[PDB]
Amino acid sequence: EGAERDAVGALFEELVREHRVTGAQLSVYRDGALSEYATGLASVRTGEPVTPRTGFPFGSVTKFLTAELVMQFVCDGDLDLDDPLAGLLPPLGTATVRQLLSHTAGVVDSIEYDEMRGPSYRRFAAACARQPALFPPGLAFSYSNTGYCLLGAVIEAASGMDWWTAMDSCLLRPLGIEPAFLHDPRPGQGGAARPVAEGHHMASLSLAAAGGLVGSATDLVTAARPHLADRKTFAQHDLLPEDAVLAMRTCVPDAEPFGLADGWGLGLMRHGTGDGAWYGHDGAVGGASCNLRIHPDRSLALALTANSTAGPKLWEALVARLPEAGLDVGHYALPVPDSAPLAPDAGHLGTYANGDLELMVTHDAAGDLFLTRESYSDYRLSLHEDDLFVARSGEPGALPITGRFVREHPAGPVALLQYGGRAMHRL
Numbered sequence: 001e002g003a004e005r006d007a008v009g010a011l012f013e014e015l016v017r018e019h020r021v022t023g024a025q026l027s028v029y030r031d032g033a034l035s036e037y038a039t040g041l042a043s044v045r046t047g048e049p050v051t052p053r054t055g056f057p058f059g060s061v062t063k064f065l066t067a068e069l070v071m072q073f074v075c076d077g078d079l080d081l082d083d084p085l086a087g088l089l090p091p092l093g094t095a096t097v098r099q100l101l102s103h104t105a106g107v108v109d110s111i112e113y114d115e116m117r118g119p120s121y122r123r124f125a126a127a128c129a130r131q132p133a134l135f136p137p138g139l140a141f142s143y144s145n146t147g148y149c150l151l152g153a154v155i156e157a158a159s160g161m162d163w164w165t166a167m168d169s170c171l172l173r174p175l176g177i178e179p180a181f182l183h184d185p186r187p188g189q190g191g192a193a194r195p196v197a198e199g200h201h202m203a204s205l206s207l208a209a210a211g212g213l214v215g216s217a218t219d220l221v222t223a224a225r226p227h228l229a230d231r232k233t234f235a236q237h238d239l240l241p242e243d244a245v246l247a248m249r250t251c252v253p254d255a256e257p258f259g260l261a262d263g264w265g266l267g268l269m270r271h272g273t274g275d276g277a278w279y280g281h282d283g284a285v286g287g288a289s290c291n292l293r294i295h296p297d298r299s300l301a302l303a304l305t306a307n308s309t310a311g312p313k314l315w316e317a318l319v320a321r322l323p324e325a326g327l328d329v330g331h332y333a334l335p336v337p338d339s340a341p342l343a344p345d346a347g348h349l350g351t352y353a354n355g356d357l358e359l360m361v362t363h364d365a366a367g368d369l370f371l372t373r374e375s376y377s378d379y380r381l382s383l384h385e386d387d388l389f390v391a392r393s394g395e396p397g398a399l400p401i402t403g404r405f406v407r408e409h410p411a412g413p414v415a416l417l418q419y420g421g422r423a424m425h426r427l
């Protein structure tokens with residue numbers, strides 16, 4: 001196996017050059033032992049090198065950790081997975097903790113809340129109540145940062161600790177992870193600050209439970225250790241029982257995360273089907289990207305952190321090449337529509353919204369359909385079979401969109417527009 005681990009480092013280092021990555025970490029747990037590759041600089045500004053201790057923004061990969069912390073309370077009886085929120089916090093009250101974890105509660109992606117100034121998530125839960133639901137809870141998938149900030153408020157209500165203090169004391173420190181955040185509102189105590197990589201977002205106090213953690217590839221792989229077939233070899237596996245781990249990778253049915261993944265569990269997404277299924281999470285904060293992938297049956301976990309804007313393309317080039325060391329990480333691909341533009345059903349015209357994001361489906365006088373947005377270019381919209389759509393903006397700077405429409409009933413009209421993992425309610 002010593003030559004496989006060599007291969008990965010050769011490939012890793014060569015891909016960080018070819019995508020001109022300032023600094024990166026890659027950690028791999030495989031065949032019962034850990035490989036840690038760290039390269040480049042934590043800051044060009046200062047010349048300090050990346051080491052495996054350097055903190056990188058996790059961004060939305062925080063969700064996998066917030067999910068694990070929430071599962072801990074489900075296992076300690078302190079919180080129920082499948083019964084209404086309205087019992088735990090002052091429409092939304094019919095959503096369950098299980099739905100928020102799988103992005104099926106119908107919460108919008110982003111509700112602005114600049115007003116949060118401290119560690120409590122109480123006042124944030126109030127402004128969420130004031131907000132329209134994308135759909136009835138359970139109807140479909142729609143990725144939501146705000147849903148995971150709601151879990152920060154559930155955790156705080158479930159235990160008695162703010163989300164930060166529960167993250168640190170129930171999950172992070174028992175795993176030997178040095179706690180580190182984009183923003184910590186607590187006075188805290190002293191001690192050297194953990195070295196962190198800069199990445200010139202979810203830099204905003206209310207987004208913490210959804211995107212605020214900071215850490216290394218090795219921390220993420222360590223948080224993956226309870227999820228593995230060989231979990232009993234991990235001395236802290238007790239922190240996440242075999243049944244919470246199983247629930248975390250059990251995908252919600254009848255809710256395809258269209259555009260992001262084949263399926264979603266509780267804080268883990270799925271790419272692939274059977275023996276080729278991988279689980280994990282992606283994130284990005286400015287110049288920093290983060291990916292975590294887990295093959296539980298093979299007891300495999302890898303995580304990449306990178307503080308350059310090629311971070312997404314480094315990750316994709318790493319997935320395309322990692323097979324050259326036997327790591328066939330699952331892939332997600334949008335479906336290419338098989339057909340030709342279908343008769344522009346006008347039962348599709350209207351305004352689709354997710355919070356403050358807004359599209360309009362219009363026609364022009366020739367009858368073709370368009371997808372417009374505030375300070376975007378217009379797209380030509382083509383309807384296809386299975387309610388698929390492609391939207392093309394002839395301009396090369398603006399990528400095409402593959403989406404789909406969603407009806408609440410097989411006889412009803414189009415209710416949801418869905419792409420990139422987000423749904424947008426027809427107004």
Ligand SMILES: *C(=O)[C@H](N)CC(C)C
Pocket residue numbers: 059060061145202211260282283284285
């Ligand atoms: C977090 O950094 C972002 N919003 C998540 C991806 C999966 C869109």
Ligand SMILES: [Y+3]
Pocket residue numbers: 080083
């Ligand atoms: Y109950």
Ligand SMILES: [Y+3]
Pocket residue numbers: 112113114115
């Ligand atoms: Y405001």
